[PDB]
């Protein structure tokens, strides 16, 4: 149904709001939540992890199967499987982890997944224990993405920062 509500608008495209994307995806019923993805779709840690538990971890197993056949992905690049009880589709990205040395540069190709997709519930991509400077992050979501997205930042200092600075 995508019934997204309480955001703050930044472009006529891009929305944000200090949320938990879980609980949003359960509010809305989004057709397509993105995942903040690792390239073996190991649903540990900060996204991830959150969506995956979230489903009781059929996410997890569906993930498995797939990467046991298909190998993994790349940086930059994205696959769609199913959202479970979250969404109709989760759309797994792959944003550089730039603490663990990868191209920055190809944040703009993580984000250029989301122009295949009318409406989305994203988180900020790259962003946390990824290392990336996120006010850079926003700017490349901005810049990159042409269709609608709802952007949850689950941390309220975080999120004040982002809105502050952009809207200098
Ligand atoms: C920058 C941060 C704030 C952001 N995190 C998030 N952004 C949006 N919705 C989120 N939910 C959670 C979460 C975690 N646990 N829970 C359950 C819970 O707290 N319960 C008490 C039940 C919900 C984190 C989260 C982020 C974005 C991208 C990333 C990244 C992190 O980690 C590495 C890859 O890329």
Redesign the pocket.
């Given at each position: 149904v995508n019934s997204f509500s309480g955001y703050l608008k930044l472009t006529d495209n891009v929305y944000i709001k200090n949320?938990?994307?879980?609980e949003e995806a359960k509010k809305v019923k989004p057709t397509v939540v993105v995942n903040?993805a690792n390239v073996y779709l190991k649903h540990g840690?900060?996204?991830?992890?959150?969506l995956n538990?979230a489903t009781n971890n059929a996410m997890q197993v569906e993930s498995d199967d797939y990467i046991a056949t298909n190998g993994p992905l790349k940086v930059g690049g994205s696959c769609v499987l199913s959202g479970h009880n979250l969404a109709k589709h989760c759309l797994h990205v792959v944003?550089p982890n730039v603490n663990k040395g990868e191209d920055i540069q190809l944040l703009k190709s993580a984000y250029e997944n989301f122009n295949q997709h009318e409406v989305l519930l994203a988180?900020?991509?790259?962003?946390?224990?990824?290392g990336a400077d996120?006010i850079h992050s926003l700017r490349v979501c901005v810049d990159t993405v042409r269709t609608n997205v709802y952007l949850?930042?689950?941390?309220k200092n975080?999120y004040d920062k982002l809105v502050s600075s952009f809207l200098e």
């Open positions: 949320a938990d994307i879980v903040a840690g900060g996204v991830a992890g959150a538990k944003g988180p900020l991509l790259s962003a946390g224990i990824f996120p949850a930042v689950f941390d975080l």
